[PDB]
Amino acid sequence: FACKTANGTAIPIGGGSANVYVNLAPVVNVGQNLVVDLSTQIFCHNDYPETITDYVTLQRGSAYGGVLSNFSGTVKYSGSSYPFPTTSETPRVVYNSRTDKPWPVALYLTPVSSAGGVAIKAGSLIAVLILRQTNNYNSDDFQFVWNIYANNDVVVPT
Ligand SMILES: CNC(=O)c1cccc(-c2ccc(O[C@H]3O[C@H](CO)[C@@H](O)[C@H](O)[C@@H]3O)c(C)c2)c1
């Protein structure tokens, strides 16, 4: 089990860390959502699908910078949504193919009442998402740590 990103970096067997750089809607109103879809950013696969079933969770999702200060919301994982920043570990998604498969995580972030002006700065860390991978074969329990950075400013109109 290993993963790759849309910026040409990777995390090998056993886990580790990578940076992810996301383009963001440049304008988000109070009462609306900024959607940060990581399923176009992070992809993983199973290295022995004939024999091994890989299990993948979102173990933890943390907010940083402008997201931490200026937004609240939820994270959608494989069709179900949970509070973000996270308060538990999600259910498992199965990886059962050698073919790249997206990690089905998306953030739905809505501005807090006091947000206004530039609410997320270009280049800044906005989140850290921990993918936990286990399997039905051995005791492997690995963390794939994804540091999510904004490519651009996000403005919340006054
Ligand atoms: C055709 N293959 C073969 O004959 C063949 C023979 C002997 C061994 C393997 C093989 C390959 C990879 C293995 O572990 C890695 O991949 C797993 C699936 O993604 C993960 O669950 C693990 O955590 C880890 O990342 C493991 C444990 C075994 C394969």
Swiss-Prot record:
Location relative to the cell: Fimbrium
Disulfide bond positions: none
Gene Ontology terms describing biological process: cell adhesion; cell adhesion involved in single-species biofilm formation; cell-substrate adhesion; mechanosensory behavior
Coiled coil location: none
Entry GO terms, CC: host cell membrane; pilus; pilus tip
Any one Gene Ontology molecular-function term assigned to this protein's record: D-mannose binding
Main localization category: other
Keyword GTP-binding carried by entry: no
Sorted UniProt keywords: Fimbrium, Signal
Function text: Involved in regulation of length and mediation of adhesion of type 1 fimbriae (but not necessary for the production of fimbriae). Adhesin responsible for the binding to D-mannose. It is laterally positioned at intervals in the structure of the type 1 fimbriae. In order to integrate FimH in the fimbriae FimF and FimG are needed.
Family: Belongs to the fimbrial protein family.
Official protein name in the record: Type 1 fimbrin D-mannose specific adhesin
Whole sequence portion shown: 22 to 179 of 300
